[PDB]
Amino acid sequence: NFAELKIKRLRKKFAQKMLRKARRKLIYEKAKHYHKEYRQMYRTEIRMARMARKAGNFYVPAEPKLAFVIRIRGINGVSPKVRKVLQLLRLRQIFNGTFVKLNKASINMLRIVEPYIAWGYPNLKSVNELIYKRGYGKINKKRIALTDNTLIARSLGKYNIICMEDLIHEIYTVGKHFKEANNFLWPFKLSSPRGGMKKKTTHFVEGGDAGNREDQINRLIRRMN
Amino acid sequence: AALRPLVKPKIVKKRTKKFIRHQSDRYVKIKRNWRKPRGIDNRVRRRFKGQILMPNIGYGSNKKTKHMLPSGFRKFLVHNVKELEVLLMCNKSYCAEIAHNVSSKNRKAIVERAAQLAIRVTNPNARL
Amino acid sequence: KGKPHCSRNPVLVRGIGRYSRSAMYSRKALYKRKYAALATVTKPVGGGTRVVKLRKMPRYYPTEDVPRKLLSHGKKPFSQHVRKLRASITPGTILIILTGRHRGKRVVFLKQLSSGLLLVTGPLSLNRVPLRRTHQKFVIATSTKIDISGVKIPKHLTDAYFKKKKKYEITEQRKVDQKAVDSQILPKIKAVPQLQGYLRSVFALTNGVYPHKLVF
Amino acid sequence: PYAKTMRRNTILRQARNHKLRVERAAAALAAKSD
Amino acid sequence: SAHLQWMVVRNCSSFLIKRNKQTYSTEPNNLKARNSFRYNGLIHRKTVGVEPAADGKGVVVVMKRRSGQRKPATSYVRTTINKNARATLSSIRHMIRKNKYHPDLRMAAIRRASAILRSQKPVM
Amino acid sequence: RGLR
Amino acid sequence: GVDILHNKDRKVWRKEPKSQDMYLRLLVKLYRFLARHTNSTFNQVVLKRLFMSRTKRPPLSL
Amino acid sequence: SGRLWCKAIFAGYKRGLRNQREHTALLKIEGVYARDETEFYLGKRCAYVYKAKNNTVTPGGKPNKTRVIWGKVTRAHGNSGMVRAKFRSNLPAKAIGHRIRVMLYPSRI
RNA sequence: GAGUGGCGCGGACGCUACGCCGCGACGAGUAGGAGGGCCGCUGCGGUGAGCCUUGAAGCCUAGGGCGCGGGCCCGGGUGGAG
RNA sequence: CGCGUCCCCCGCGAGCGCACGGGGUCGGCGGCGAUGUCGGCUACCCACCCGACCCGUCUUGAAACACGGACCAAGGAGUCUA
């Protein structure tokens, strides 16, 4: 007849529009829920430190769950064990970056490459810029840029990471599906530090840049991103 | 007047000079035709600085403007009138060119026929 | 049928409206404005009457055609471009036209035209400069302003007025329009002393005068 | 999507704080005049 | 069949003509005149050919029939169209679209016939 | 359906 | 400057049969179309096997 | 009646110690001797005025012998009011320590 | 998906499938290996209703170009039979 | 931001228009144009700036005070058989 088939093809086209708008409001309200979480996360850290100092006791805050490890030294003249650990951290190129969650098994991997990395505990805004600007996805073994929400949802939807804000949440708040979210991200192709390194060769403690930089990786992320 | 092509891009060229052979300047026996230097100590082979350039695949021209004349057409080598009615349906992209040893009296028809079919000739008033 | 009301939410930032879409829902009030659910013109011709077809199919096809381009969005014509000014170029300021045949001359700014170009008239008496355009980029805004605000520039002299037709002969409308605004400016430059010969005088770079040092 | 809402809220809060700062400066000037 | 005797003709046909990084086919019924599975005018059951008329003006339309395809003489039926620049192009659009006769060659033939009409149209 |  | 060994980059499967015989090449055209446009993995294996050498497609006896 | 361009010197090219990159020129603008004072001249047009044997056409009137290669002050160089200018044709190095004109008329005052 | 109950005669490009196209990542290199050459030389079977005394081969060139390159195509001169 | 309904506390509205929205367009312009100028990157000569030792070879290492090479043409070296 086609009196049906015109009207039937519109209803299915309508059904998929309201299917987008229902998903779209969820992505908003999940992101607004996170703005409450990050407020409540940020404020309780200061809150605990005040009720400590009021008593006169010390609040030792939780050892950081999450690092950002930047390779700083070149590909030439690298020890075979040190080659292996850098390429298990997916740092195969100078000024590559990846998120590494801390445990006993991973800090001993991050101490064995201390000359050849610049690592530390990244800021919430440091996670933001890396996932929006430098955020690329490993979709079908291809570095496809995270330009739309239906790339992360396509790959990470089964772990209920359906938008960019869910991924930033999964990275910053090291959740149960950090492995599937971190490995989804292509290792971040950062530029050379705009302003200049101090001293590539030596540790940060001895006026260098090589190894741990606890809050000080955020000064260098914006220098490089 | 001129037969304009369909589309006329900017023909960008990565290199306009020739890849002269290493030591074609010192010797007359060494021709100006490139040979890859396969010496164990050759400066030009192992990329020393201020040296004769080795041709790589990276110097390759853009695939849309490859073999394209400055006029915007690509050449086709025409021996007789029968090889012009092959070009009449690629009239805007490709142009005719009449072979060196085609006679003066036959050029007088090939150029005269290519004007009827409105096909560009690179060398129309060649012999006369 | 309804008259087009102006947008209820003001522009807070470029792109961002000031009111959210719950505040905006009650500004429009959509809780009570809810809704439910050519070609072949025939001709009588003196074996019957004929039907013609306007937009008839073409009689020549070229041997190959360029395929239709993709659709870009933010590429307007020059006619619809947003027109930009400076903080230093306000109507009545004195401008140093740098590039034209009137190069270096102090030439009086009237108003911004509808093409970004500056309608300029450094009085024809003094600069030997008529009703003419200049470009913002090819002009230095001097920190000296005759209080022009009480002029009545002819609105009929527009952007199409100064656009070249194709030696050049002056039509007398340009002589009258110059002569009308002549009697509103020269009696206003002379309200300030030593400003009359200053406009007659030219701009130059002498030994030691470096533009990065003179604020002017 | 929530980015637009957050931005708008930030720009409104910034404007309100700036107005408050101007008001405080005016009040301090008035106290000094007294 | 069409696909079989393409896998022979594709590289080693006598009409095939390779030089200057270009490949053509000088066949009496190839139009666009390139070595192609679509436009080859020996291979298929249905073959639209467009040529300049034996007279000064006009375009012939070479139609290949259904029956005699092993029959090289009784195969091709020719019809000369000496009309205006619109209803010579129209005749060819009507011969192809409204007979279902090789509608791949509907637009490739009209660009040709136009360029033949353009050729037999004097210079100023 | 709830826009009526 | 990336430390990837390009030793194992070029895969040594086959993309076409080395045989220039047309009948077998017309069959490949028919299973190139089916290997991708059918959900079946039968047509993937049959296509892959048409490319293979004489020693890799041995005579299965009655 | 007077000069409508500032005195610059084509001092050298954009060069390392043992490599020069000819496409970027170094312009020593007379008057500016720090990056404090270099702010005015960035984005300004800068011309290399030379004259040769054969006559060439002129925009304005009759063919002269004088020619130019046009340029554009790209961004500030070093720490001492030196500036980088990128020319449409890469300058000849016969002009090293010769007068090229930093103009005023991509004006932003 | 499909059954049965409760006025206008119109629509560009394409796809040598050994083709066309899209997205990602990568590119040192002796010895050495393999691949692709519409790279080049000389004969052969085909083939181009090829070219040529209205000037073949060759040879020269401050000519026009093309190809990443091997090289090649033209313009001019020279030459006399392929 | 509906009502017609299903609990623990108190399935398609109808349009427009503007656009930081899956990679540039201008629905903007102005000049000079016949033996004196226009373009031609390439190719002839020349100048400047930076770089730049002479190839082949054996060698751990060659610009080497290692050896072959004054220069040019033609010839010249993984073949064939089992």
Swiss-Prot record, chain C:
It comes from the Eukaryota. Keywords: Acetylation, Cytoplasm, Endoplasmic reticulum, Isopeptide bond, Phosphoprotein, Ribonucleoprotein, Ribosomal protein, Ubl conjugation. The keyword Cytoplasm applies. GO terms for cellular component: cytosolic large ribosomal subunit; rough endoplasmic reticulum. The modification Phosphoserine is found at residue 72. The modification N6-acetyllysine is found at residue 167. PANTHER family: 60S RIBOSOMAL PROTEIN L6, LARGE RIBOSOMAL SUBUNIT PROTEIN EL6. Belongs to the eukaryotic ribosomal protein eL6 family. This is Large ribosomal subunit protein eL6. The lineage of its organism: Eukaryota, Metazoa, Chordata, Craniata, Vertebrata. The gene is RPL6.
Swiss-Prot record, chain D:
The modification Phosphoserine is found at residue 33. The modification N6-acetyllysine is found at residues 4, 32. It is found in: Cytoplasm. Citrullinated by PADI4. There is a cross-link at residue 32 (Glycyl lysine isopeptide (Lys-Gly) (interchain with G-Cter in SUMO1)). Component of the large ribosomal subunit. May bind IPO9 with low affinity. Interacts with RBM3. Belongs to the universal ribosomal protein uL4 family. Component of the large ribosomal subunit. The ribosome is a large ribonucleoprotein complex responsible for the synthesis of proteins in the cell. This is Large ribosomal subunit protein uL4. It comes from Oryctolagus cuniculus. The chain holds residues 330 to 363 of 413 of the full protein.
Curated annotation (Swiss-Prot), chain F:
It comes from Oryctolagus cuniculus. The chain holds residues 114 to 117 of 245 of the full protein. Belongs to the eukaryotic ribosomal protein eL29 family. This is Large ribosomal subunit protein eL29. Component of the large ribosomal subunit. The ribosome is a large ribonucleoprotein complex responsible for the synthesis of proteins in the cell. Component of the large ribosomal subunit. It is found in: Cytoplasm.
Swiss-Prot record, chain H:
SUPFAM superfamilies: Translation proteins. Keywords: Acetylation, Cytoplasm, Ribonucleoprotein, Ribosomal protein, RNA-binding, tRNA-binding. One of its GO terms (biological process) is translation. InterPro entries: Ribosomal_eL33, Ribosomal_eL33_CS, Ribosomal_eL33_sf, Transl_B-barrel_sf. The keyword Ribosomal protein applies. GO terms for cellular component: cytosolic large ribosomal subunit; synapse. It is found in: Cytoplasm. One of its GO terms (molecular function) is structural constituent of ribosome. Its main location: cytoplasm. Component of the large ribosomal subunit. PANTHER family: 60S RIBOSOMAL PROTEIN L35A. This is Large ribosomal subunit protein eL33. It comes from Oryctolagus cuniculus (Rabbit).
